[PDB]
Amino acid sequence: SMRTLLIRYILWRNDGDPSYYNDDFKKLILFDELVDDDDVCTLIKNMRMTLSDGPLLDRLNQPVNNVEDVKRMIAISAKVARDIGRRPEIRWEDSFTILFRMIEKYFDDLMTDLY
Amino acid sequence: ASMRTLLIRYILWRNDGDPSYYNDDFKKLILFDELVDDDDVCTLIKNMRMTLSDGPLLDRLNQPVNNVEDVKRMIAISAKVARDIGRRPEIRWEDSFTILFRMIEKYFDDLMTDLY
Numbered sequence: 001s002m003r004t005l006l007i008r009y010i011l012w013r014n015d016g017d018p019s020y021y022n023d024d025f026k027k028l029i030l031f032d033e034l035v036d037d038d039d040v041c042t043l044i045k046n047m048r049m050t051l052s053d054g055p056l057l058d059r060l061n062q063p064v065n066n067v068e069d070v071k072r073m074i075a076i077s078a079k080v081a082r083d084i085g086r087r088p089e090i091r092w093e094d095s096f097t098i099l100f101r102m103i104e105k106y107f108d109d110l111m112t113d114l115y
Numbered sequence: 116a117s118m119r120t121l122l123i124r125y126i127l128w129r130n131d132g133d134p135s136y137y138n139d140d141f142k143k144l145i146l147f148d149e150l151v152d153d154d155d156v157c158t159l160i161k162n163m164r165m166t167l168s169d170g171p172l173l174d175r176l177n178q179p180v181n182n183v184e185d186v187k188r189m190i191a192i193s194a195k196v197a198r199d200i201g202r203r204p205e206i207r208w209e210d211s212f213t214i215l216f217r218m219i220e221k222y223f224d225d226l227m228t229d230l231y
Contacts, residue, residue, distance in 0.1 A: 001204040004127050008136065011120045019138060020124065088117040088223070093212040100209055107204070 002107045006074065007096055010054075014081040014090070027114050031075040034068075040079050047080075051087065054095025055080045057102055064102050067109040073102060118223045122190065123212055126171075130197040130206070143230050147191040150184075156195045163196075167203060170211025171196040173218055180218050183225035189218060 009028045012020045035043075047056040055077040064070060077099055084090065103110070125144045128136045163175040171193045179185060193215055200206065219226075 001131070001202065001206070003204065003206065003208050004131060007123060007127065007208065011123060015117075015120060019140075022135060024135075086117070088119065090117070090119065091216075092119050092123060093209055093216055096209040097213065100207075 002104075002110060003096075003100060006077075006099065007092075009074075010077050010081045010095075010099075011092065013078040014054075014084070015086045016082075028074060028078070031071040032078060033075075034072045035075040035079050037079065040083050043076055044080060044084070049080075049084070052089045052091050054084070054090050054092050056095065056098055058098045064106070067106055067113050070103045070106045070110055071113075073099065116227065118220075118226055119212075119216060122193075122215070123208075125190075126193050126197045126212075126215075127208065129194040130170075130200070131202045132198075144190060144194070147187040148194060149191075150188045151191040151195050153195065156192075156199050159192060160196060160199065165196075165200065168205045168207050170200070170206050170208050172211065172214055174214050180222075183222050183229055186219045186222045186226055187229075189215065 005024055005028075008020075008022065009025050012022070012025060043060065047053070047059045049056055057073050057076060060076075062069070062072075064073060077095070121140055121144075124136070124138065125141050128138075128141065159176060163169070163172040165172060173189055173192060176192070178188070180189060193211075
């Protein structure tokens with residue numbers, strides 16, 4: 001389940017808790033190269049995020065046409081999740097709804113690329 | 116501590132049973148399983164009219180959520196339902212967690228008091 005893997009991965013990028021580290025995350029961390037750290041606060045402002053939002057990727061109005069675009073969206077989710085801080089108000093369910101709507105069609109292409 | 120992150124991690128682990136995703140943070144949550152009989156679970160699943168692409172749809176159960184003890188039952192139902200529906204990729208966890216957190220978030224403070 002790419003749903004299960006990606007939820008676990010983003011939540012771990014958010015809290016950085018080493019007791020929730022998993023080897024399954026290693027190939028996902030490599031996608032970080034697709035996003036510059038210095039653009040993160042720009043991506044956050046473009047998604048008009050409040051303190052109670054996770055990544056709201058649909059608000060970037062960037063197309064998802066292929067597996068490379070999925071990797072970028074995962075990378076944006078990871079770095080945003082990283083920089084917004086370990087905060088209880090974050091409505092992760094809304095963030096994952098948006099993410100999976102945008103990328104689920106390419107789950108097949110993603111699993112081929114990972115494995 | 117985010118009850119959202121703990122509970123997502125906990126239910127996903129009750130769904131796949133993957134021992135590399137076990138965490139000690141789950142021990143106190145496992146004890147809530149006593150609030151739900153294994154024999155009732157298939158009945159709760161049928162009542163929620165769940166398809167293969169549904170996680171727990173707790174709002175369909177017509178059960179009351181008025182205190183922290185009721186939250187513990189809802190978490191326990193989530194766990195045993197997540198357990199019995201199988202490790203299937205089509206499960207729309209985001210919809211399931213939306214319903215769960217809508218139902219229980221107001222009691223997060225009472226929950227964290229009971230856990231700690």
